[PDB]
Design an enzyme around this catalytic site. Structure first.
Site, PDB file in Angstrom:
ATOM      1  N   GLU A   1      36.492  14.722   4.189  1.00 14.15           N
ATOM      2  CA  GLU A   1      35.459  14.395   5.166  1.00 14.15           C
ATOM      3  C   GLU A   1      34.451  15.527   5.244  1.00 14.15           C
ATOM      4  OE1 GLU A   1      36.346  14.902   9.326  1.00 14.15           O
ATOM      5  OE2 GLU A   1      35.210  13.123   9.923  1.00 14.15           O
TER       6      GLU A   1
ATOM      7  N   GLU B   1      30.479   7.825   9.260  1.00 15.48           N
ATOM      8  CA  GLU B   1      30.587   7.656  10.693  1.00 15.48           C
ATOM      9  C   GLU B   1      29.260   8.080  11.311  1.00 15.48           C
ATOM     10  OE1 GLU B   1      34.366   9.691  12.092  1.00 15.48           O
ATOM     11  OE2 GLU B   1      34.191  10.349   9.994  1.00 15.48           O
TER      12      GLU B   1
ATOM     13  N   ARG C   1      38.794  19.668  13.015  1.00 16.53           N
ATOM     14  CA  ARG C   1      37.487  19.174  13.418  1.00 16.53           C
ATOM     15  C   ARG C   1      36.443  20.263  13.701  1.00 16.53           C
ATOM     16  NH1 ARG C   1      40.498  14.371  14.125  1.00 16.53           N
ATOM     17  NH2 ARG C   1      39.228  12.482  13.985  1.00 16.53           N
TER      18      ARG C   1
ATOM     19  N   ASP D   1       0.832  -1.204   0.000  1.00 16.64           N
ATOM     20  CA  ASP D   1       0.000   0.000   0.000  1.00 16.64           C
ATOM     21  C   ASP D   1       0.875   1.266   0.000  1.00 16.64           C
ATOM     22  OD1 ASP D   1      -1.880   2.078   0.421  1.00 16.64           O
ATOM     23  OD2 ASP D   1      -2.201   1.490   2.521  1.00 16.64           O
TER      24      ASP D   1
ATOM     25  N   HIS E   1      29.541  11.946   9.525  1.00 16.06           N
ATOM     26  CA  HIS E   1      30.615  12.411   8.671  1.00 16.06           C
ATOM     27  C   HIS E   1      30.694  11.500   7.473  1.00 16.06           C
ATOM     28  CE1 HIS E   1      32.657  13.637  12.720  1.00 16.06           C
ATOM     29  NE2 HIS E   1      31.634  14.422  12.428  1.00 16.06           N
TER      30      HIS E   1
ATOM     31  N   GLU F   1      27.339   8.354  14.393  1.00 18.33           N
ATOM     32  CA  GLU F   1      27.402   8.327  15.853  1.00 18.33           C
ATOM     33  C   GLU F   1      25.997   8.148  16.415  1.00 18.33           C
ATOM     34  OE1 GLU F   1      29.226  12.151  15.792  1.00 18.33           O
ATOM     35  OE2 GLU F   1      31.224  11.449  16.381  1.00 18.33           O
TER      36      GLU F   1
ATOM     37  N   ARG G   1      31.724  16.940   7.152  1.00 16.17           N
ATOM     38  CA  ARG G   1      31.361  16.815   8.573  1.00 16.17           C
ATOM     39  C   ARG G   1      29.952  17.262   8.900  1.00 16.17           C
ATOM     40  NH1 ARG G   1      35.405  15.494  12.129  1.00 16.17           N
ATOM     41  NH2 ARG G   1      34.281  16.508  13.873  1.00 16.17           N
TER      42      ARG G   1
ATOM     43  N   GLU H   1      32.022   7.750  22.366  1.00 13.90           N
ATOM     44  CA  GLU H   1      32.201   9.095  21.823  1.00 13.90           C
ATOM     45  C   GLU H   1      32.135  10.145  22.918  1.00 13.90           C
ATOM     46  OE1 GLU H   1      32.711  11.497  19.639  1.00 13.90           O
ATOM     47  OE2 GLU H   1      33.496  10.378  17.933  1.00 13.90           O
TER      48      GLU H   1
ATOM     49  N   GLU I   1      30.331   5.231  18.670  1.00 15.61           N
ATOM     50  CA  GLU I   1      30.625   5.248  17.252  1.00 15.61           C
ATOM     51  C   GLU I   1      31.232   3.916  16.853  1.00 15.61           C
ATOM     52  OE1 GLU I   1      32.823   8.612  15.854  1.00 15.61           O
ATOM     53  OE2 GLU I   1      33.697   7.544  14.122  1.00 15.61           O
TER      54      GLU I   1
HETATM   55  C1  LIG Z   1      45.724   2.417   2.443  1.00 15.24           C
HETATM   56  O1  LIG Z   1      44.657   2.326   1.359  1.00 15.24           O
HETATM   57  C2  LIG Z   1      43.300   2.836   1.834  1.00 15.24           C
HETATM   58  C3  LIG Z   1      42.220   2.842   0.940  1.00 15.24           C
HETATM   59  C4  LIG Z   1      40.971   3.313   1.354  1.00 15.24           C
HETATM   60  C5  LIG Z   1      40.815   3.765   2.666  1.00 15.24           C
HETATM   61  C6  LIG Z   1      39.514   4.257   3.157  1.00 15.24           C
HETATM   62  C7  LIG Z   1      39.390   4.697   4.426  1.00 15.24           C
HETATM   63  C8  LIG Z   1      38.062   5.205   4.912  1.00 15.24           C
HETATM   64  N1  LIG Z   1      37.646   4.994   6.181  1.00 15.24           N
HETATM   65  C9  LIG Z   1      36.519   5.702   6.311  1.00 15.24           C
HETATM   66  C10 LIG Z   1      35.761   5.699   7.615  1.00 15.24           C
HETATM   67  C11 LIG Z   1      35.090   4.351   7.815  1.00 15.24           C
HETATM   68  C12 LIG Z   1      36.758   5.956   8.741  1.00 15.24           C
HETATM   69  C13 LIG Z   1      34.673   6.757   7.594  1.00 15.24           C
HETATM   70  N2  LIG Z   1      36.167   6.369   5.196  1.00 15.24           N
HETATM   71  C14 LIG Z   1      37.132   6.070   4.280  1.00 15.24           C
HETATM   72  C15 LIG Z   1      37.066   6.445   2.931  1.00 15.24           C
HETATM   73  C16 LIG Z   1      35.852   6.830   2.374  1.00 15.24           C
HETATM   74  C17 LIG Z   1      35.805   7.215   1.039  1.00 15.24           C
HETATM   75  N3  LIG Z   1      36.909   7.218   0.270  1.00 15.24           N
HETATM   76  C18 LIG Z   1      38.104   6.841   0.772  1.00 15.24           C
HETATM   77  N4  LIG Z   1      39.205   6.850  -0.009  1.00 15.24           N
HETATM   78  C19 LIG Z   1      38.191   6.463   2.109  1.00 15.24           C
HETATM   79  C20 LIG Z   1      40.379   4.671   5.224  1.00 15.24           C
HETATM   80  C21 LIG Z   1      41.649   4.222   4.854  1.00 15.24           C
HETATM   81  C22 LIG Z   1      41.870   3.758   3.560  1.00 15.24           C
HETATM   82  C23 LIG Z   1      43.119   3.296   3.149  1.00 15.24           C
HETATM   83  C1  LIG Z   2      35.283  13.088  17.878  1.00 11.78           C
HETATM   84  S1  LIG Z   2      34.432  13.695  16.598  1.00 11.78           S
HETATM   85  O1  LIG Z   2      35.096  14.825  16.021  1.00 11.78           O
HETATM   86  C2  LIG Z   2      32.933  14.196  17.153  1.00 11.78           C
HETATM   87  C3  LIG Z   2      31.980  14.686  16.044  1.00 11.78           C
HETATM   88  C4  LIG Z   2      30.679  15.280  16.622  1.00 11.78           C
HETATM   89  N1  LIG Z   2      29.943  14.295  17.424  1.00 11.78           N
HETATM   90  C5  LIG Z   2      29.749  15.810  15.554  1.00 11.78           C
HETATM   91  O2  LIG Z   2      28.667  16.287  15.902  1.00 11.78           O
HETATM   92  O3  LIG Z   2      30.070  15.756  14.344  1.00 11.78           O
HETATM   93  N2  LIG Z   2      34.204  12.618  15.548  1.00 11.78           N
HETATM   94  P1  LIG Z   2      35.394  11.799  14.698  1.00 11.78           P
HETATM   95  O4  LIG Z   2      36.675  12.065  15.413  1.00 11.78           O
HETATM   96  O5  LIG Z   2      34.955  10.366  14.773  1.00 11.78           O
HETATM   97  O6  LIG Z   2      35.346  12.388  13.312  1.00 11.78           O
HETATM   98 MG   LIG Z   3      34.950  11.817  11.368  1.00 12.69          MG
HETATM   99 MG   LIG Z   4      35.292   8.692  13.624  1.00 13.37          MG
HETATM  100 MG   LIG Z   5      33.024  10.584  15.914  1.00 12.02          MG
END
Ligand SMILES: COc1ccc2cc(-c3nc(C(C)(C)C)[nH]c3-c3ccnc(N)c3)ccc2c1
Ligand SMILES: C[S@](=O)(CC[C@H](N)C(=O)O)=NP(=O)(O)O
Ligand SMILES: [Mg+2]
Ligand SMILES: [Mg+2]
Ligand SMILES: [Mg+2]
Ligand SMILES: COc1ccc2cc(-c3nc(C(C)(C)C)[nH]c3-c3ccnc(N)c3)ccc2c1
Ligand SMILES: COc1ccc2cc(-c3nc(C(C)(C)C)[nH]c3-c3ccnc(N)c3)ccc2c1
Ligand SMILES: C[S@](=O)(CC[C@H](N)C(=O)O)=NP(=O)(O)O
Ligand SMILES: C[S@](=O)(CC[C@H](N)C(=O)O)=NP(=O)(O)O
Ligand SMILES: C[S@](=O)(CC[C@H](N)C(=O)O)=NP(=O)(O)O
Ligand SMILES: [Cl-]
Ligand SMILES: [Cl-]
Ligand SMILES: [Cl-]
Ligand SMILES: [Cl-]
Ligand SMILES: [Mg+2]
Ligand SMILES: [Mg+2]
Ligand SMILES: [Mg+2]
Ligand SMILES: [Mg+2]
Ligand SMILES: [Mg+2]
Ligand SMILES: [Mg+2]
Ligand SMILES: [Mg+2]
Lengths: 475, 475, 243, 475
Positions: free
Chosen positions: A363, A130, A344, A51, A273, A132, A365, A216, A224
């Site tokens: 990132e 991320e 940050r 629906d 984020h 939270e 944010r 967090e 987180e």
């Molecule tokens: C060393 O080679 C890599 C390749 C991709 C990688 C991606 C991440 C990564 N981690 C995160 C979170 C989970 C902490 C939010 N986001 C990314 C991310 C997201 C989008 N694009 C990239 N390149 C990385 C972190 C480290 C990496 C390292």
């Molecule tokens: C420690 S924090 O900077 C906290 C973020 C906050 N809670 C917000 O509102 O974006 N997050 P992270 O280090 O995981 O990116």
């Molecule tokens: Mg972050």
């Molecule tokens: Mg984080």
């Molecule tokens: Mg965080």
């Protein structure tokens, strides 16, 4: 995965029920259950009905019937149900033409990915999120003619340091978390280690690849968990499943989770984020050793898009009235439209990743978990792509604590919007970048605007706030 | 231990999670969790990131990203988590240069050990610690505009002799501990035998080499457990793990532990006596059969350094406002700057150890558990080394009850500082001995001073004390 | 003397009117945290042969040399004078910024952030006076008024010049200018220490004697300073229970 | 009245105390008491002092001293105080120059009246006001980190029909007032007849000339009392005294009154309708038998001014966040900027008065009682005079139910502002009509804007609303 892969999985896991899931427009997953014996080829060939008029942002009552068609990639065993259950996400389709629905959030994500390819700019947009959340013990609220209240509660809440006993009558044992002090002391200060372990395990068992988990900053059980990034649509499917697993692991263990942006006043909000990067033919596009923070022109123009389109983009990334309670200074959320490495307090932070081009990303944010990840991720991509296509130059990075800027300097920087009504107004006035390639259509945009005004903005605006009584009772 | 030793341990113990730990500046361990599947060579080569701006005494928000690199020697199985977990301590590093962080307490201890070697005075500083604690049943407290309170409670507390029933409604069965009478009658007067046994067992199972455990002097569950001494850095790592194990063993068994210096008024405080000795090429340096209390010149000058630098050194060994509530007469804590053999009223006691040169050492009785053992041990070493290097002669030992001195002789002996603000003031004025060899840097010292003033000294000073109402309500 | 007798009778009447009507009054300096303390501002002037001595139309804020030197005495002797004007541990909880009590040793007209305020009284010489804002009601008005007088007289006798008036919000001074102005004492033990070290201005003419001063110092140490110092504060539990 | 008239009154009434009153900037009367024996000529010649830094919108702390000079026309005997008391209003003056204070609201009203004369347009502006209020039994509210509430209660509140007993345990006897049903059934449905009679009597005894009293539309004790109109300043003094008499009559009889605009959700708000007319040399200027609703050009242009300036004028007539909760459809308050005869849905209503020119006037329905009547009346006059001076033509009257208009038609007429921040923004951008003749000065306007942003708008915006939890907890 293919249809036969899912049938084999269902048979091998001795599944009793299949849970058919799809996303409503605001961003809550919807479901019904069919027996395993009704899960056959017909489900793939003919689909299933529901629906459309009872789902938010979908159909009117006289055009109610809608169709669902399965997405075999999304098949996962449910960790919670005593009767063995297989969860599968579906796409919404027109029941006459079988055309994909223009207001199916999963279809928007599908269209975004295809539009990306068609531009030639890249073939893959990766999203790492991320989300939270707070692990509370209880919540209640109401709204009457003569009064209104809310209260959330948590054993580790600093507001409870003076409690004579805990909720069950057991002794106050201290080790509660100070405001802004939750990131991230060891147990017993951290009272949620075992629960977060269970959340981590449930995620691992549903095929997530885990990176980390931690308490967090917020008092009263802020948390987180991070899992591996993925391409847009898969990433948005992962987000929905993650929220489901988080909420229900908490529930089964006697707790109650919220993803709302700002449940506590004077403590950290909860963001979503979004780390983002574009790749083409298996190679990264974000990296240039000679740019500021190792950013290529493509990356810088993507950021230019995000920051330029922000006043309307937040309608999808920060889509609730509560969102704007989080966008206030002093809590690691953005208050203005700048990018900056390591920062940050910024709207876009470039994390420090070194010389590895594969790790280079931005990132964003600003976004929170209060809406729809299919729409949010899609909207971000469409803003970034507009940035690249028009070579939008972001204003210069500001490598400062953005909450502590001098008046003269702060006023030369565009602020984040104050309130939902402003971003909805702006979205209405300027949304052409979203409609590129028919990724978002006018009917979706108009429904969204209309939904937020009638169901959120207006209802909050007409209701007296408790603090108005503090301010004005004795006028 | 090596990287491969830790991988083997993780695999053999079928570890599900690795807990990544490091020390904030004030002295609380911080943590996040990664899955076993994410614990690989990359953790050793590239390290892991965190938010330095959420950690006390670390980074500002615009320079937030920090890096962590593992210390394989610290790897231990966690006794508490239902999901099998391996705990490892990390060093904090700059994310650009990979230089060790100047405000990482574990780095300071590293630097202290290296500086010792570089002086040629010795190659090893051994620390034996006695971290006393209270095993309470409950605690609550608050601070409001119109009132403030705290209360701790414990079944064995003498304040409960007249209770009609226990907290759960069961009968009062007596055998409660008299004030100053907990050291150390047998059960049932000692009501914590089984719990301390569990603490002892948890320590043994985490690789501690145990020496003893007992009830301490204080009513309401004061306790002490001793483990084998070790070199400075290892000893500080042992102290942090010990506090974690004590607190959490108590927590899992329905109790609540505090290491605060003075939770009870009119009963013993909790100290962290530090037994110290220097060794070179496997031989002890503290012993000389012809010296007072068997002490060599090196030992005597070390003491000279501790007692000379005490007015600033206590900023790291007695770093809280509550510390100074313990430095009052009549409770086996110091009130003045003297050394003396066999003397539990003294600032430095020389325990009676006989002719064995390997057992000769000094007991610094002043420190408590309210701060950071990495900084405290390091600061004590730096003071003692300045004493040796400058041949600082302590004033003559006083072999009397230092609480019962006639006002005349007591006036000639330097007192311990009255309050935190005084030692912080003195640290600011005179800290050159700490900066020798760059062991402590000015940024650490300035951050410490600033932290204590803004977060501790001032907040306590501006808040009315309940006893001021006793004194002054009727003025 | 009449003024000190008036003060004692006033406190009695206030406390007992409240008591008879079901209330309870306190004159303590700071019973509430985060709200105004209770002061005992003392407006002071010297007169001779029925004529006022505080007024000079050409002085800053209409103040004569005699008045300015009196102020010089109050501000110069403050580090020991507060032992009688702010004589309790609770006194020092009131001497914090943002509540119209002093935090540093300055005079200034119209200024409720200052240690000495000169109220705006116009050209009438009989109305000219200084308001010493530092004192509170937690001690002895006979001793407090007397000590203030002795400090002011030492100022006149030695022609002690106060530092220049500061006509700003003394709570909002930049750290730089604030560092140059002498602060009010932080705590009772400091002013008691200072009183012990330097109290000659009080002993002039035998107005205060050494036995009184020694008894005062000894009383405050044994019955007030020490008892508060040895007792854990509830906020220490907020700060340190989980160390 | 003269100084000697007031002395005679004080002597004849055997007055023990004189209450010295003046108005703070937001609109609350301030006071202190002097004995009758201190009330002499000196009070008139030299005035009295106070701390301008403790009064909202007045002085900084370093320029604190301010002066007060009496207004003998305002002397009235206080109906409430057991010790016989005479109330007198004062003007605030500079203590050096004795110049009238630029931020004394009573001075603004004084200036407005003189400016009117100086234009030659008229010599008198008459204001008739209707300040509605609620007679409640109780109110409580708070705002914490983890929760917030308000509640108002009233025996006659419709929310109490199902109550087992009244607050004191006595039986529920029904006859409670339906929502929107309070205007105006006889007792016992009207439960406030005797109390309103007491209010009426206290007003008459303070020299008010009374017109009527009644229950108003709102459930839970809404009420209205009308007294005879007066010239601007006298009218604003009358309003302040009226609020004081209503509030304290209620208080002495065990009730609690609020004048806040919208204390109940889903029932009528409380307005301060202002009936306005201009007179010259004892003759009325508002009447022309040939105009729509009997209005002259002067009248029509005055309305033109009100409606044209409304977007900024509401900053003084509707000056609180709660004001904008009343400006919603369906409650006899305005939602758009139209005038219309007989029309209680309009912004300006022309009451039906027949052919008598002396009775012809406009009713400005927009204002509420939440601010400052001195500033409100003055601002309205300034807007009206700007209308006359520039011959501003109002748009055509709309003789329809403005709440029942289909949305496309509603959009074709200018709306009332949605929220306080909008009118404050607009006031900042455009306020020249208020500064004409120095009636309002820039310092007053800037202080007002600054006060509202920092103390009202921002504090409400950063605090989560209880209905956000209803909407978003489960996002
Ligand atoms: C060393 O080679 C890599 C390749 C991709 C990688 C991606 C991440 C990564 N981690 C995160 C979170 C989970 C902490 C939010 N986001 C990314 C991310 C997201 C989008 N694009 C990239 N390149 C990385 C972190 C480290 C990496 C390292
Ligand atoms: C420690 S924090 O900077 C906290 C973020 C906050 N809670 C917000 O509102 O974006 N997050 P992270 O280090 O995981 O990116
Ligand atoms: Mg972050
Ligand atoms: Mg984080
Ligand atoms: Mg965080
Ligand atoms: C007989 O040979 C030895 C050698 C080292 C010895 C060390 C200790 C020792 N015990 C403690 C505690 C746990 C009771 C605080 N501290 C020490 C200690 C500490 C530092 N240096 C030395 N030499 C000894 C005690 C006895 C020893 C005996
Ligand atoms: C018959 O002659 C008159 C003269 C003035 C009159 C004034 C009013 C009047 N009443 C009110 C309230 C109390 C109901 C708000 N306002 C007015 C009023 C106010 C301002 N100007 C005028 N002309 C009338 C009502 C009737 C009048 C009748
Ligand atoms: C029995 S005691 O002297 C007590 C020490 C006291 N609690 C202190 O505050 O240092 N300790 P130990 O004998 O273990 O050295
Ligand atoms: C309004 S106030 O400035 C307040 C003084 C404050 N309670 C104090 O602690 O001194 N006093 P006053 O204006 O009576 O001199
Ligand atoms: C009955 S009503 O129209 C109600 C007015 C409504 N309370 C308002 O908010 O303006 N008032 P009136 O008839 O006294 O002008
Ligand atoms: Cl909004
Ligand atoms: Cl201190
Ligand atoms: Cl003190
Ligand atoms: Cl607003
Ligand atoms: Mg011991
Ligand atoms: Mg011991
Ligand atoms: Mg010992
Ligand atoms: Mg005063
Ligand atoms: Mg009316
Ligand atoms: Mg009415
Ligand atoms: Mg009306």
């Amino acid at each position: 995965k293919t249809p036969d892969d899912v049938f084999k999985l269902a048979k091998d896991e001795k599944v009793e029920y299949v849970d058919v899931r799809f996303c409503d427009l605001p961003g809550i997953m919807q479901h019904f259950t069919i027996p395993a014996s009704a899960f056959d080829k017909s489900v793939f060939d003919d689909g299933l009905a529901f629906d459309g008029s009872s789902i938010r942002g979908f159909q009117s009552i006289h055009e109610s019937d809608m169709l669902l068609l399965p997405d075999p990639e999304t098949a996962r065993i449910d960790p919670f149900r005593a009767a063995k259950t297989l969860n599968i996400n579906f796409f919404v389709h027109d029941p006459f033409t079988l055309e994909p629905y223009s207001r199916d959030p999963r279809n928007i994500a599908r269209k975004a990915e295809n539009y990306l390819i068609s531009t030639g700019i890249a073939d893959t947009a990766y999203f790492g999120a991320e989300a939270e959340f707070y692990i509370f013990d209880s919540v209640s609220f109401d709204s009457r003619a003569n009064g209104s209240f809310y209260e959330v509660d948590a054993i580790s809440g600093w507001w409870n340091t003076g409690a004579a006993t805990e909720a069950d009558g057991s002794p106050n044992r201290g080790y509660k978390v100070r405001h802004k002090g939750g990131y991230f002391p060891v147990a017993p200060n951290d009272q949620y280690v075992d629960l977060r372990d269970k959340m981590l395990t449930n995620l691992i068992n549903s095929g997530f690849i885990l990176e980390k988990g931690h308490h967090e900053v917020g008092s009263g059980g802020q948390a987180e968990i991070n899992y591996q990034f993925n391409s847009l649509l898969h990433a948005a499917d992962d987000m929905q499943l993650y929220k489901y697993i988080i909420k229900n692991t908490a529930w089964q263990n006697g707790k109650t989770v919220t993803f709302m942006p700002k449940p506590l006043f004077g403590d950290n909000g909860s963001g979503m984020h979004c780390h983002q990067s574009l790749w083409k033919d298996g190679a990264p596009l974000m990296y240039d050793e000679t740019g500021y923070a190792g950013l290529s022109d493509t990356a810088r123009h993507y950021i230019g898009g995000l920051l330029h389109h922000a006043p309307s983009l937040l309608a999808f990334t920060n889509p609730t009235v509560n969102s704007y309670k989080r966008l206030v200074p002093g809590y690691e959320a953005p208050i203005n439209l700048v990018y900056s490495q390591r920062n940050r307090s910024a709207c876009v932070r470039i994390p420090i990743t070194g010389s590895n081009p594969k790790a280079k990303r931005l990132e964003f944010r600003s976004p929170d978990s209060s809406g729809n990840p299919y729409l949010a991720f899609s909207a971000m991509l469409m803003a970034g792509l507009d940035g690249i296509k028009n070579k939008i130059e972001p204003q210069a990075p500001v490598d400062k604590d953005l909450y502590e800027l001098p008046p003269e300097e702060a006023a030369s920087i565009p602020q984040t919007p104050t309130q939902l009504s402003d971003v909805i107004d702006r979205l209405e006035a300027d949304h052409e970048y979203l409609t590129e390639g028919g990724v978002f259509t006018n009917d979706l945009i108009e429904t969204w605007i209309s939904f937020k005004r009638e169901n959120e903005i207006e209802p909050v605006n007409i209701r007296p706030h408790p603090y108005e009584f503090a301010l004005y009772y004795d006028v």
